[PDB]
Amino acid sequence: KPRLLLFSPSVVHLGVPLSVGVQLQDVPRGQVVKGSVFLRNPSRNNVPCSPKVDFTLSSERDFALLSLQVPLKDAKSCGLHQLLRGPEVQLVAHSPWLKDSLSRTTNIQGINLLFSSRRGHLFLQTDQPIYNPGQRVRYRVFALDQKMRPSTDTITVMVENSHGLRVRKKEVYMPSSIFQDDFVIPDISEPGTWKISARFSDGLESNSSTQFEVKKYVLPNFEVKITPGKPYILTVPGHLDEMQLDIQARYIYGKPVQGVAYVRFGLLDEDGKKTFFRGLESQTKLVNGQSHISLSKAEFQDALEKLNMGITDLQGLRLYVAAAIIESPGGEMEEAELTSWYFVSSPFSLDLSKTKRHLVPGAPFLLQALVREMSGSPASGIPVKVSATVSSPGSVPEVQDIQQNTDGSGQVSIPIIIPQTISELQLSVSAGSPHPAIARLTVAAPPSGGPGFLSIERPDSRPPRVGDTLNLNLRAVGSGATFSHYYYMILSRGQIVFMNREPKRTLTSVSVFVDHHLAPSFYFVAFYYHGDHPVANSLRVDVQAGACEGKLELSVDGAKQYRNGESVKLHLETDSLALVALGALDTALYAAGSKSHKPLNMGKVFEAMNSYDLGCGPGGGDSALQVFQAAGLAFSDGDQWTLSRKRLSCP
Amino acid sequence: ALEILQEEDLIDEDDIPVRSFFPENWLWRVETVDRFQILTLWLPDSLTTWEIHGLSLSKTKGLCVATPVQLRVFREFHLHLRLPMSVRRFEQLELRPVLYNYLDKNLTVSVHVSPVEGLCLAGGGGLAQQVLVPAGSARPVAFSVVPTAAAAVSLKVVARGSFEFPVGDAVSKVLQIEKEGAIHREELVYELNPLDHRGRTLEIPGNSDPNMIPDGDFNSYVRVTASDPLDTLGSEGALSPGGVASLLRLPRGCGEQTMIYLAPTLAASRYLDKTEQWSTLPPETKDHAVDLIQKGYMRIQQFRKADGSYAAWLSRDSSTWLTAFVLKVLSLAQEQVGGSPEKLQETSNWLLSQQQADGSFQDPCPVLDRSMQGGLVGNDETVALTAFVTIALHHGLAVFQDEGAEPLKQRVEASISKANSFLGEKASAGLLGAHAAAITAYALSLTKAPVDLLGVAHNNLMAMAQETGDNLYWQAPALWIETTAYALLHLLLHEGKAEMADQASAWLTRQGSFQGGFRSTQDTVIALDALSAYWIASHTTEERGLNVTLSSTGRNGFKSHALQLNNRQIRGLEEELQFSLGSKINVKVGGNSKGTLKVLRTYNVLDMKNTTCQDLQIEVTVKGHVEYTMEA
Amino acid sequence: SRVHYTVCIWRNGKVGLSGMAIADVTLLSGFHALRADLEKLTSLSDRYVSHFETEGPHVLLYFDSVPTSRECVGFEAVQEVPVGLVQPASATLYDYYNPERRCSVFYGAPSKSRLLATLCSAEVCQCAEGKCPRQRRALERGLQDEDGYRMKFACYYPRVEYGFQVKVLREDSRAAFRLFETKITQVLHFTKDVKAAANQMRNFLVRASCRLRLEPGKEYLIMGLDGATYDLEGHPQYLLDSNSWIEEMPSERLCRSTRQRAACAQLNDFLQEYGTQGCQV
């Protein structure tokens, strides 16, 4: 009848406050339970590895969200650093309620967790993306905590050369939370990519890095760009699309180059072997710094015939274009090379990551797909057809055909209605025409005779903005409504961020305010109880409007068009007293690079933020244990509980 | 007519801003910005487009990275000069400055490379070349130069436009002269193995080769790679996770039955501790097990007879075997549960007065059921009991602490020495049973017997040894399971993570896995302790680190470098260091990891034959009459 | 007015990398190629050059085949503006499929030479560009003065580093130089080779295209800037160029005579004084 519920992230980060949930089910109106929850148990006696935090729960205050510190000193002293095999630790809640009420042989209930020394966020940037041998590499690393504020903890940084060997190691205490340093590349160093790695001193698992290239180069004065008309070529025999490219070359100060673009063509394989056409080379003089060239279908077919190659062989490979432009009359020459032009069998591509698995028999299934140009951007307004076969509940199978156009950002969201006791669901998706893009998905249904199911329905499929309130509709499915409440919580970045409860009503609706802590991706988990059995379901919500908590806005007041040696007023705006790290690159360095590397940018920061997210897949499961484990949680009620996961991998 | 010139009626160079600052990245400063800041930048002289980093870090708002600002600088009339990476001394090269005119008027410009010390240049650098550049057009103004300097020379190209249109520009840029000869590199490879005496110390010679240029550049680099085994491992372990937890049973009956319940319950708890399988069991099981141990400790001391002896019922005469077994259980339980030490000290003292004149021990009233004793009917019961009491006494020895127990320890350790002497004598004497030999060797190895005694016990067991049916030596009888467990612990104690120990553990684990666990009594208690000890032993031994100490004397005098690729956590770590030196380097190798040492010597070697224009060829001839000024 | 070009390409690289060729040739500073001549070349049936482009002194020529034997194409250029400095220029042949593999060659005007004038002895070389002949006898001219600016010339501007009165023994020639072999009569100043002394053999070179007249058996005052080549027998070696002082010393009769009377004594007074006093007091 009565229950103690313990919720926590499945992975404990040492030095990070661990959010722990505790809750009471079916507890008499006046009854009160008090206790303590704490982290425990290397096989060294049974020593606590954390301070204790006390909880007090009532029938009218039946859930609490607790912050349990897990500090380095106590984790070290208890013996987790001396632990053998995997890094596993226990969370334990201690209350005499288990003795007084449930009559267990213990006053303890817990969960078995994993732990990691990985903590904080480490970012680092370099003087340039590419250097000559013998040149001084300036760089700096930034140390932030889980809360995303500057951290002063000691960090260890190491520089790894093109060969792969450590060339330098520094371990330094951060007063201002930035480490600025410099070193000189060996003059005799081989061209190649160098790698800088940084960790917290206590964080042996705190991987973070940045890379740069060393290459012998002289700084170009213009950049040449090969741009296909479309970054794909249909090799379907029904219509081989015509190859055409806008080739541009432009001085780095903006004006267009005048000169001749000497272009060569061939086929490049996956391994890296490019077989040039002998013939079909194109020589063209730039007009307004551009040259439009094309390869005729007859020329291409003869070139394939020249190589004894058929159009049916071109399911792999890519059409290789390399252009060496010689400036006239200056005589400077630099090359462009295009490796993006795959031979494809459809102009579109289907991404079915969004579509939830393990869906509730008796509730609408939401088919979510992203239609993208093949090697391009999302496809807008493309018609998508879904063929959904509900496999025999004992009656004859039936097929449900629903068609919808991509609303935007490739998003199509189709509600195929799934009836009770479906044996399994088989999904075939066809997007756009000519030459439909196709993908197939099969997913099994919950085992027979479940306690109940929970339908989580999201009316607005748009990624909510930071500051917009998202409303989710929660409906119990499949069993009597003995329960009077359902309980929900918001998980973000691998932490329980919010936990609350909504009483059951006709068409119950729960409001989730999307704050900056929920960016960029969070899980909505909700559950109710049928007798002594938990019923749960989970839904992933991506927040794609992410931006700075404050701001940094760099600007140059004026109309640009500055001359050399003039005064430029660089304006810096922010919302706090901030340490602003600056650096001005000559853009020629991007052109010079054999493999260009994108700078550090806000998308990388948000991606780094969500590397702590324990969540795997879009949510949902056949059982509440699966739902909680899929969300990223560990759970125990005293009878049903979660075994430790195989780390973050989710194999 | 058409060849008219404007010679020296042009802007006089003094009034031309000369462009000289050409950085590839700049503005690297970090500034404190209190919500707003304005930096009055002074632009560099290179006409390109700049991309500006911006990371804002603050205590209250955290990290913010701005969208980069594009800033491009353009002069509308300018000269661009790409100098090569490096040019050899005394080898002619073509400098190719290009004038760009983006005005709507044709420009006539007089261009010359200013005379500079270290460069040899057409006509001595005084002569200047007029050239006319159409509107919206560019033209190269190639100059041919051969450099005489040995290091670097700043060369200034000056373009003086008409006085009618005072266009003008100047570029001062530093030309790097390549050192005499050409770069060459030799890598010396030496495999490393400081384990035992092989390559612990060695001396590496330099480059004798007289092909080196003496006053050229000289650099040397030392770098080392260590390689651990790539094997996927043969170890098994991890006896069933949940079967061991089914041995936890609260003591019900009187003493012997309590011990039948408590001894596997403690052993299971110790195994689950030692093997770290609590994570795969219900989380509060350890709390329950510890409460069972606490209940067991409280239970057993109610059957404790006159200062430290045990029987199931107080009226019964004390059993030596049970008292030793209870002592072994409660001495280990002392780690989990803070029991009374003095009671254990008394219990060991009582066993001392069960020893005879020599080391032998006897039991005047054994336990009722032989299942506790492993079916020890007949055979080497007295020998096995003597070893068994010695094992129990050794566990009890650790209880002794502080001044009061310093004499108590002394009598026990002397008794242990007499017991050890008897146990080695019995092993020496002849053909004991395998069970007796294994327990005797285990007892001797616990008490760290001298090699004169310990080795004979070890060697005699090998002579006895008989294969069980898979591998190693002792469905299967309880005696085989118990004997193997004693042998496995003896092998581990004698040699850590022994190869023979691996095979014994594999058989014993298989024996343990019958329908989810052992169902037998005495064997299980020993086997759980042995298997857990094996699992700790296999993972405890970790070899890490390689340490290479290098020393030499040379141009930079006495110098020494010690580099170690250990640091406690080897992150696939390989390491390189620079160590320029003379022609001999002394190498001292420490640590315990296989590796490879590479010493790289780089220097300038004689130039050798030309590579260019050995495949492709080009030739050009010019005929006519060229109009010249100031040729004479 | 006009000039005529002949460009030849070929390859020995059938063993090496194969591919078509781009010839990038740079014309003399004031010459641009005639488009009419080049386009006629481009429209021939067996043209060799299958595409071209030009602006200013630059001509690009695409050759879609490269044979083992010489493949030559001629064209012409017209002079925009006089050439101000006697200098070579370069032509560069890039492989179409391997621009890294190339051949770059210097060529010169018809009267001029392929490379810049440079003096080399053993492992050291020295610039030889410039107009050699000071060739100055002030005694028989109206420019001679009693002002006494000889020391000012030597010390301040254009400033002198070596100074000798030298007897010329032979006039020889080597490479692009005429070589006066001399013996030092008296030393006046040194910077390099402080151990220079009278009766030492020395070499004073002059560029062969220079029209300096120096007679063996006569004694000349020779001062100038230090060289850097040195003789093969070890003695430091000098080159005559702009701002060197070359003057023939007169006799008593050619000092006693009215035209240089007492002015020649002032020259002699400087010559002894500077050699003993040194440049700075």
Ligand SMILES: *[C@@H]1O[C@H](CO)[C@@H](O)[C@H](O)[C@H]1NC(C)=O
């Ligand atoms: C951490 O980085 C090191 C060095 O690159 C690498 O060997 C290791 O596999 C990384 N660990 C993870 C979990 O990525």
Ligand SMILES: *[C@@H]1O[C@H](CO)[C@@H](O)[C@H](O)[C@H]1NC(C)=O
């Ligand atoms: C400017 O150059 C163009 C291009 O050759 C020419 O047509 C025009 O006559 C020139 N004007 C002057 C004033 O030289």
